[PDB]
Ligand binder design. Structure first.
Ligand SMILES: Nc1ncnc2c1ncn2[C@@H]1O[C@H](COP(=O)(O)OP(=O)(O)O)[C@@H](O)[C@H]1O
Ligand SMILES: Nc1ncnc2c1ncn2[C@@H]1O[C@H](COP(=O)(O)OP(=O)(O)O)[C@@H](O)[C@H]1O
Ligand SMILES: Nc1ncnc2c1ncn2[C@@H]1O[C@H](COP(=O)(O)OP(=O)(O)O)[C@@H](O)[C@H]1O
Ligand SMILES: Nc1ncnc2c1ncn2[C@@H]1O[C@H](COP(=O)(O)OP(=O)(O)O)[C@@H](O)[C@H]1O
Lengths: 138, 426, 399, 417, 435, 111
């Protein structure tokens, strides 16, 4: 039996229940998972090679831009990426009581049961679909 | 507002000199416990001490939880306050010690000061040049300009299905998002596309504002307990156990503490230690008390308020050891005990009147006297519960206020613990 | 013909038999006795309907078979739809995938509703074999009996045209419907704080209909959802509605569950907790402390007790006649008297069992109306609990 | 400015104040009293530092509040891996007591690994088929193979990028261009941050030491390593993968000098709550070669051992008691109490009068010491409320009247609710 | 790092050629009858004729049961595997107790598997000698043989391999000048990489250039791999190769140690026997030393006295330290040594008497020697006296701290004053019982 | 059902041939087969929500020895609707909707 999907009607604001104002989410640089792209040696190298404040390379706007672009690179950290890489029989079985036989044949011979009544998956039906959730799902 | 059991408690009621008023800020009587509360609240506001414990011990229905909520209100929402219950520690996918440590971490908060700016721009002006350098146009209701971006931003943008005439937000440091339509999608009369549109945003093309996000150490721990997404590691399906089993302290919590200290020294973050209110402490096991009297000794443990309703009894998990307040002598010591005293009939009547004023119920003089009598007969909570159905029946019968007849009828209708036990002998 | 909601024990009751002033009646809405308990049930129901007060609890005490659960089911029915009524037993909290405290605090989530109104535009239409397959803008023959609009659409809309083409804010969705194609439909959805689970992960409505989700994220998705739904309130976005949480045979709870309920009923969104217990002086599970109803005093003081007196001969026979009306059984006055006697002697539920068996025997013997001999032979065939206890003398594999 | 770590319960002790000859002073590093216990702590600390033996356990006994945990924290601060845990931490739902205790034991040991590899780093001038790598002191052209050509495209390497490539074709683009940042006025990518051009020889070999504990079994546990190193990680920890592989590899690295082990300390506070299973496991675990120095603390005398109806000293089996060196503490006296209260007041930035100190010492003698330690800050806050510059007897008396002690609390329990 | 353990002086049972016991028995002293029984059981193990036999090292605490256990283990040598286990390790929250016991039994059993492979390697010089078309058919162009000029460090040797392999050659990037890994029977070609002789310093690439092979082209590499039966069980348990196993969420939970008897026995045993009788492997049953056996639950003993009945079960050395005590998991069921009376009938009890004060002195002296610190006669006598008073293990622990005290005091040898001071700074539990 | 005569492709215009006649079905892409399902000579039977490659068409005379086994051309019409009175329990539907296994989205297969 092929049963139809159970439609789950729900409000649209439900999907927008954990969204926070764009002008309130601060840049959380506390993510220590940066140890998947940086090394301790390269971390130290970056620390020892940070450009100085002068950086001799509209005037006040450009100065503020240079200041903010000098502020961000000062952030540097790493947990471990190098130490991880620096450290490190499929015999044949019958899978049953039969003397000798191809496992494929074993699995193909005995398959009596089929699912009783598997339907498709459930689908929420909020008449409004917020762009954020749809974009994330895509 | 959906008045709750502790709504009238909007503060602790201390004067400028520090003494507790007879009746103010919703609280009545209990001057000694209120003074202790006003001292420990200043202790917390000092932000210098750590791990200091408090115990709001006293008979039942004395307002220990009311005093805890008063402390929480006086402290304000600027500092975290974690209401916790002993039964909550008995988790199925996390060990009790780990749940307790997670609550302790939640009881610590830090404010992140940051000044973020945006670079909203028009997509129709998209004109890359060389994939190595790209330019985007700016057209808002107050000005029009153009910007120059790193090709990485152009990649993150083209990743999204941008279209001519869309509003896109470009942050100066990282990130980008699309808002479809700027008073041009509905103009062409083409039907909807499963998304809602938005007019062009007002204000300058380039905006800057100060940001202050209140985040707690537990949020950082939970965020660092996952791969953060991104590449194929982003695999995430239902039943995902976001509250993972445990997280080591030396290599994960230690790194969080180190980075927080660094950003605080840099002036970007500001720490605001909160409070951990653990109610029904007697429910915790002895193997929980033994770890609790040690974790609160660390240099990072916040202020923890305790409340033991029942008196001396057998400790949980022991079945043989008996200690006062159901807490072992090991944890009992080093915890400042604040004894809460019983209320007098006049104080009970005053609390009943305050509850009636807060909940909107209007009671008469004789009605208030009868309700206070019924309360002191068995307990104040019974009168507090009967107060509402009294006014309900009054409204049903067409009476605005409560009278002796209504209170007597509702008292005879329902029954209390004492009355129930009296008739339960049958 | 045969439906799922067949005739049951508590099916005869279809409401609470009260007047405008909550005055009970002798026989109405399947309710016979328990006048004081019925009035208390009506009072607490009106209180719940008010919704201005939160954090209240009630306990329905009484001997077994005294309408304990009948009054609760009648209150549930009188509450009617549009208000969540989570009915569970004291054994449901004992779950494996989730802790008992988490199971209980989630059951609380199932007892608070929230109404949200969405205003969207839906277009009419009919499928005329549009959007042919393999064999640009294309062509859309939108037409209605009242007025037709033959126009085209973009490429991202011609491939979603297809019997009734009910185009909505989504990317299209499926006699020709009447009326103007443009019609404003205001649909209102009521969820029982499903936001905590519907926004737990990706593909999480799957969990909302599966319970596979383990212990929710404590103090990280329940408080934020509460704050957001509160912000929705007072701003015209959404409004919360308090429900009811009925825990039948609540004495199965342990000291942990009682201690958790002590403070769970002290929150802004705390639903009205109605409970019921048959036990009297009994040790609280997990401890040796003997308390009334197996519930600690610190919680019994937080709730109102509701006693249900036993039924008399009059009420017994009236409930029997109500059950007869519910079922298709018919008997003579002598049979009514005999059944009322047997019920007042042993129990009312056993009397209903006996009358059902007697109707069955009558149908078997080709009879049209049950008689005294039928119920007598039934009682002879089907033994009573007390009757079987007397025959326990046989010592049938004792402990 | 308030930081994560601040004045706490054991922050007044900066270490185990001892002389060169392990002669405990009266009070130097914040710690006072417990001369014999302090000398025992110093002896065991020197033993740990020596690392000549393995599988040694020390039991710190004494009544509650005798400074056992204080001595432990002082030794830890003076002691360099250190792992402090409690009897309830090892109890895990997804990990058996034995597995958690073994994980703690292995995490209590440190291991230093020296790594030396060839590195080539410099600013990229132009690619192609061939690379033109520039540095401050020179520039060089390199021919690119198929693997290098594929890596130059899978990662968007371009001119100005300060690239880095060791052997095994492990290329890295650590940070973006140096000079070109100018024309990127408005927006700057998330990963495209800038760095200074390197100097010196283009190709250079760098020697770095990686410090990791013996708990690296989790790293070699599953296909993905970094993931399990943050949260609980794996729970199985098959005996084979632990002993036959990690121990042998560490031994080979020690032989060839690639790695060196540094045994730490495992402090299990309140060991009395451990089950007989944990003690029986420890009985053998302390016999292994790579076993750290174990320290314990217990306030129990003749008490029942959890999990059984048997009673023994310190609430632990006799089988283990024959394997521990008991270091019992002595209750503090009037002078020691007054001195530790002075130290606590000096650390908490609290000034009190001589009469105030005398009353506080009298209270701490009639009651527990932690009670007086808390009364210190309580009276300090009371004085701040009164706006006084120094805490007087009135403040400590008011606090003593406000906050109750175990003794007075129990005495006032006559109500019995 | 020597990292002296608790008791490492034991190097073997130290039995004479006749099988009797002596004092200086390779580190271990005293325990004549016990060491003789250890010798008998180790001779049994070496015989490898009996299986499923258990022995109990019953004795009061301090008798060195674990000491003699490690002694017999070392005597067995690293050749045969020795899996030490404690009763507490059986309690697992993810896998049942009996399956953990069976996994330990499997670990205790060893198996050496040999593998000889004839492989040819060297710089290739491909060339196809043109040959007349298939003589059975018409005419045209064919290739009857394909000559590969494998050049090794010792010399050059052209191999006239089968022409059908030409597909493999073209499959991999086998160009003139690279090292290939040929297989005698299979014939599959696996290019190792170009020769380092062509690795110009200006060419930037890694893992592509390899040094020339040292030795003759034809190499018969003989390698032996010793893996316990549990290793093969685990290897055949989990899957490998595609099948979307790369998933993280639904697969990262590798601890599926749960095992069934069908796979454990049956096919694995049969393939092991096939490798044995065919000459590909040699079975090596080891020993399973289970100390603190009294800590096991009755559900563990009831499975032990059934697994020991199997022909494949290895030798088990139980070491119970407790006396008459209630069996764990039972309701006040007292049995000797905390072991059910039914299992004690299947184990040989090796009794160990208490050490004589002279034996205490000998143990203290040899432990001091192993530590590397000299002790005077008076200090050694005082150590022996205190070890006679209290538990013996207390004295041995007083060597290192006394040694450090002496070294810090300016003296080398441990004088009586040092041990006297340490006895007051540190004391035992018997004296600590005075609460 | 019927031998696949054409398999040209999202939507796939497949061609099934039977003893009755031939019909070009405008089948949906969700049914697009992943395994061999040869474009021609393959006997396939489909129902609306999975396809079953019954066997290879009766071309046994084309080759003397072929790995594929053959079945005769289906005689029934291509498109046929048959009413099946299937007996199931409510718990079947319950546990099926609990963790469905139908559909074709990748999220389903991963779940
Ligand atoms: N000082 C007070 N003034 C006014 N009302 C009070 C005071 N103390 C307690 N109450 C009321 O009495 C009730 C007792 O509740 P709670 O604090 O939970 O009691 P417990 O002491 O058992 O925690 C509260 O609902 C509160 O409204
Ligand atoms: N006043 C009443 N009116 C109608 N039916 C009743 C009344 N009281 C009891 N009943 C019926 O008698 C039986 C009593 O069982 P119930 O009260 O549900 O037992 P419990 O509450 O202990 O589970 C039920 O079938 C109930 O429907
Ligand atoms: N000799 C000492 N020097 C400094 N502080 C001490 C000393 N003895 C005790 N203390 C103080 O006593 C307080 C509690 O003692 P604690 O360590 O809990 O005793 P125990 O070792 O029994 O756990 C600590 O806050 C510590 O500051
Ligand atoms: N005969 C002996 N010779 C030397 N040392 C011994 C001897 N017997 C026991 N020991 C010492 O006793 C200590 C532990 O003995 P052990 O094998 O653990 O016995 P048990 O397990 O019964 O306590 C070891 O450190 C070892 O040095």
């Amino acid at each position: 039996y092929v049963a139809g999907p159970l439609e789950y009607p729900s409000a649209s604001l439900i999907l927008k229940a954990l969204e926070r104002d764009f002008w309130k989410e601060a840049d959380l640089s506390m993510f220590d998972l940066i140890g998947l792209e940086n090394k301790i040696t390269r971390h130290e190298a970056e620390l020892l090679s940070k450009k100085k404040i002068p950086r001799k390379l509209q005037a006040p706007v450009y100065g503020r831009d240079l200041l903010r672009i000098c502020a961000l690179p000062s952030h540097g950290r790493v947990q471990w990426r190098g130490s991880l890489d620096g450290r490190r029989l499929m015999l044949t079985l019958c899978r049953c009581g039969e003397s000798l036989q191809d496992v494929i044949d074993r699995v193909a011979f005995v398959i009596p049961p089929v699912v009783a009544a598997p339907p498709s998956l459930r689908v929420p039906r909020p008449p409004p679909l917020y762009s954020h959730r749809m974009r994330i799902l895509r | 507002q959906r008045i709750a059991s502790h709504s009238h408690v909007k503060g602790l009621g201390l004067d400028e000199s520090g003494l507790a008023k007879q009746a103010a800020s919703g609280l009545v009587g209990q001057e000694n416990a209120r003074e202790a509360c006003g001292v420990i609240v200043e202790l917390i506001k000092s932000k210098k001490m750590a791990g200091r414990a408090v115990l709001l011990a006293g008979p039942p229905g004395t307002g220990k939880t009311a005093l805890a909520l008063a402390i929480a209100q006086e402290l304000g929402s600027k500092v975290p306050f974690c209401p916790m219950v002993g039964s909550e520690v008995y988790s199925t996918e996390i060990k009790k010690t780990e749940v307790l440590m997670e609550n302790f971490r939640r009881a610590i908060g830090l404010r992140i000061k940051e000044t973020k700016e945006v670079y909203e721009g028009e997509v129709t002006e998209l004109t890359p040049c060389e994939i190595s350098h790209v330019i985007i146009g700016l057209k808002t209701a107050k000005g029009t300009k153009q910007l120059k971006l790193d090709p990485s931003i152009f990649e993150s943008l083209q990743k999204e299905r941008v279209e001519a005439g869309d509003v896109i937000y470009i942050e100066a440091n990282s990130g980008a998002v699309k808002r479809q339509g700027r008073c041009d999608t509905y103009a062409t009369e083409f039907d909807l596309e499963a998304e809602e549109y938005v007019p062009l945003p007002k204000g300058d093309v380039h905006k800057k504002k100060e940001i202050i996000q209140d985040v707690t150490l537990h949020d950082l721990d939970v965020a660092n307990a996952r791969p953060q997404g991104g590449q194929d590691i982003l695999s995430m399906m239902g039943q995902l156990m976001k509250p993972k089993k445990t997280e080591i302290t030396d290599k994960l919590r230690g790194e969080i503490n180190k980075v927080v200290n660094k950003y605080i020294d840099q002036g970007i973050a500001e720490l605001v230690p909160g409070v951990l209110f653990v109610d029904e402490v007697h429910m915790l096991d002895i193997e929980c008390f033994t770890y609790l009297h040690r974790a609160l000794e660390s240099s990072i443990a916040p202020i923890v308020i305790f409340a033991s309703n029942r008196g001396n009894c057998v400790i949980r998990g022991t079945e043989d050891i008996t200690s006062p307040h159901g807490i072992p002598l090991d944890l009992l010591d080093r915890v400042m005990i604040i004894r809460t005293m019983l209320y007098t009939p006049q104080e009970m009547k005053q609390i009943i009147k305050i509850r009636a004023q807060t909940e909107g119920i209007n009671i008469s003089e004789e009605a208030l006297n009868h309700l206070g009598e019924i309360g002191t007969k068995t307990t104040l909570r019974y009168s507090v519960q009967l107060l509402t159905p009294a006014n309900l029946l009054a409204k049903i019968n067409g009476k605005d206020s409560i009278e002796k007849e209504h209170v007597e009828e509702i008292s005879e209708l329902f029954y209390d613990a004492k009355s129930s036990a009296k008739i339960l002998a049958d | 013909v045969t439906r799922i909601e067949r005739i049951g024990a508590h099916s005869h009751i279809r409401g609470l038999g009260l007047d405008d002033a909550l005055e009970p009646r002798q026989a109405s809405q399947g309710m016979v006795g328990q006048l004081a308990a019925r009035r208390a049930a009506g009072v607490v129901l009106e209180m719940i309907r008010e919704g201005k007060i939160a954090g209240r609890a009630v306990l329905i005490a009484g001997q077994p078979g005294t309408g304990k659960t009948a009054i609760a089911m009648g209150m549930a029915q009188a509450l009617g739809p549009d208000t969540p009524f989570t009915a569970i037993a004291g054994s449901e909290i004992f779950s494996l995938e989730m802790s008992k405290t988490e199971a209980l605090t989630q059951a609380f989530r199932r007892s608070i509703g929230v109404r949200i109104k969405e205003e969207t535009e839906i277009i009419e239409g009919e499928v005329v074999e549009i959007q042919i397959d393999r064999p640009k803008v294309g062509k859309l023959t939108l037409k209605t009996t009242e007025m037709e609009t033959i126009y085209d659409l973009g490429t991202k809309m011609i491939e979603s045209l297809t019997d009734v083409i009910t185009i909505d804010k989504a990317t299209g969705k499926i006699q020709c419907p009447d009326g103007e194609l443009q019609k404003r439909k205001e649909v209102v959805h009521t969820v029982s704080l499903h936001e905590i689970d519907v926004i737990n992960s990706r593909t999480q409505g799957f969990l909302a209909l599966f319970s596979g989700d383990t212990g929710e994220i404590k103090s990280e998705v329940r408080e934020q959802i509460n704050a957001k739904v509160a912000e929705w309130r007072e701003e015209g976005k959404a409004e919360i509605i308090p429900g009811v949480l009925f825990i039948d045979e609540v004495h199965m709870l342990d000291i942990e569950s009682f201690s958790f309920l002590n403070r769970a009923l002290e929150s802004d969104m705390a639903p009205v907790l109605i409970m019921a217990t048959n036990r009297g002086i009994t040790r609280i599970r997990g401890t040796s402390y003997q308390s009334p109803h197996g519930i600690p005093i610190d919680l019994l003081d937080r709730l109102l007790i509701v006693s249900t007196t036993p039924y008399s001969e009059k009420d017994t026979k009236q409930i029997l006649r109500i059950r007869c009306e519910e079922e298709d059984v018919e008997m003579s006055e002598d049979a009514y008297t005999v059944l009322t006697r047997i019920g007042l002697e042993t129990s009312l539920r056993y009397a209903i069992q006996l009358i059902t068996a007697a109707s069955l025997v009558c149908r078997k013997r080709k009879g049209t109306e049950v008689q005294v001999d039928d119920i007598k032979r039934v009682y002879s065939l089907f033994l009573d609990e007390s009757r079987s206890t007397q025959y326990m003398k046989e010592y049938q594999d004792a402990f």
